[PDB]
């Protein structure tokens, strides 16, 4: 459990991977991201670029796939999405070398969670703030990287939160490439999956059921090939959900609950998967992060927990 | 000038001992926190903020990413 | 507040006190030197910080440190402290 130090001057609010999984970027609360790459030599990660980025504290950041070049989704709490692109003629440590492409000022309020869509939809975007209202951001043109359309445009809320209560959202898409277009939206208390139509536009296609108490991460299993698709969510209850979906609107869907895991009694801040679904990794409010597999049975039993 | 503020998130933790009137930061280093408390009898004792992991982001080469709700560091587990 | 003093538990020349605080949520074992009149002498040992309501305290002089601590819910805790 090596650690290295971020160098941020204050909290660090997100960190993700690449594809390749040899580049980190995170965003944090002193308005800035900086991105560090994995070293082949020495085996120690070093910054890349340490750039300011927005105004205010950023929350959410997700890279692109690398087919489109390197582009990176930042949201903070200052109504607005950034991407940012990599110029390769450029000194390192710079603060120069990721040039901004566009400013997406078309939220109303401070957003929580971006994601890139897989690469089979194109350069699609998935904006959520506490506006209540998904927005859909697509690159048509692949001349240009720097227009992008809003597309579809889904109300998830009926009213904005208040000013002090908390809220948390988070997003997941579907890295099914046989499936039709499929997204998570975990908006406050209601995790609900929005499916493409024959129209083009999204509708509500399933609600996962349970969500006593507030939603703090959704995640999508990568599917493999398998039958049945995964979904795992951490509440501020110590649940763990795993929901097992069958598909077969020209699809409809059924979800089933495949398990409810109480091992942390806290809050379950982060869950994610692995690259094949193999390994869920859950981080909760007991200072413990419990890693999961399935046994022989498709039910999850829980494995090697580190604290 | 003027900022808007609103609660994105919040941190619970439980003292170690009941009937507790009155509490106090410790300012720690590397962004660390302790709470020094007061209990209703007058006694004061010394109690640590747990350092909660708030990202376990998984590799696709089987690594583990570690984030924590209190300092800047970035805690990796490798496949090796 | 009940201060008891406890005898044949030293083999020195100190002698051991045991308190209870006026909210009657404490128990407190303290040694106090008697040839030394300054506040200094009065040594907290060992403070046991649960409980809540106490209504009763006694020791026991044949075993050293054995110490019964009643409660107002019903509960008698009796444990060792020395």
Request: glycine share 6%; charged share 25%.
């Amino acid at each position: 459990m090596q650690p290295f130090d971020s160098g941020h001057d204050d909290l660090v609010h997100d960190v993700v991977y690449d594809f390749y999984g040899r580049h980190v970027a995170t965003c944090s609360s002193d308005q800035h991201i900086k991105v560090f790459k994995l070293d082949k030599d020495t085996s120690n990660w070093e910054l890349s670029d340490s750039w300011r980025a927005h105004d205010s504290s950023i929350v959410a950041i997700d890279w692109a796939s690398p087919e489109y070049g390197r582009i990176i989704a930042s949201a903070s709490y200052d109504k607005t999405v950034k991407l940012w692109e990599e110029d390769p003629d450029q000194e390192e440590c710079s603060g120069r070398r990721w040039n901004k492409l566009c400013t997406l000022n078309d939220s109303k309020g401070s957003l929580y969670s971006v994601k890139f869509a897989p690469a089979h939809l194109g350069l699609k975007l998935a904006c959520l703030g506490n506006d209540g209202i998904l927005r859909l951001y697509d690159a048509l043109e692949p001349s240009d990287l720097r227009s992008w359309t809003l597309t579809s445009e889904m109300k998830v809320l009926s009213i904005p939160p208040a000013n002090h209560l908390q809220s948390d959202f988070c997003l997941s898409w579907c890295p099914s490439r046989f499936s039709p277009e499929k997204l998570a939206v975990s908006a406050l208390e209601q995790a609900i999956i929005y499916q493409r139509g024959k129209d083009g536009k999204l509708h509500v296609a399933a609600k996962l059921p349970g969500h006593k108490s507030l939603i703090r991460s959704i995640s999508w299993a990568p599917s493999i090939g398998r039958w049945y698709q995964l979904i795992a969510t951490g509440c501020k209850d110590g649940r763990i959900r795993i929901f097992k979906i069958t598909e077969k609107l020209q699809s409809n869907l059924q979800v089933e609950l495949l398990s409810e895991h109480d091992d942390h009694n806290g809050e379950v801040w982060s869950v994610s998967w692995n690259l094949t679904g193999t390994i869920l990794s859950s981080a909760g409010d007991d200072g413990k992060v419990r890693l999961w597999k399935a046994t022989y049975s498709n039910e999850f039993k829980c494995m090697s927990v580190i604290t | 000038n003027i900022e808007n503020l609103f609660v994105s998130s919040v941190h619970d933790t439980n003292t170690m001992y009941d009937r507790v009137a009155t509490f106090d930061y410790i300012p720690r280093s590397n962004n660390g926190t302790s709470l020094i408390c007061m209990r209703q009898s007058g006694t004061i004792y010394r109690m640590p903020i747990s350092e909660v992991c708030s990202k376990a982001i998984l590799n696709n080469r089987n690594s583990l990413l570690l984030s924590n709700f209190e300092n800047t560091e970035i805690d990796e587990i490798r496949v090796n | 507040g009940l201060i008891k003093k406890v005898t044949h538990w030293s083999y020195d020349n100190l002698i051991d006190y045991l308190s209870v605080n006026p909210t009657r949520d404490e128990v407190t074992h303290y040694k106090v030197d008697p040839e030394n009149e300054s506040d200094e002498s009065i040594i907290k040992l060992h403070t046991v910080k649960d409980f809540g309501s106490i209504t009763c305290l006694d020791y026991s002089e044949s075993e050293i440190g054995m110490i019964g601590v009643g409660e107002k819910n019903g509960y008698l805790r009796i444990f060792n402290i020395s």
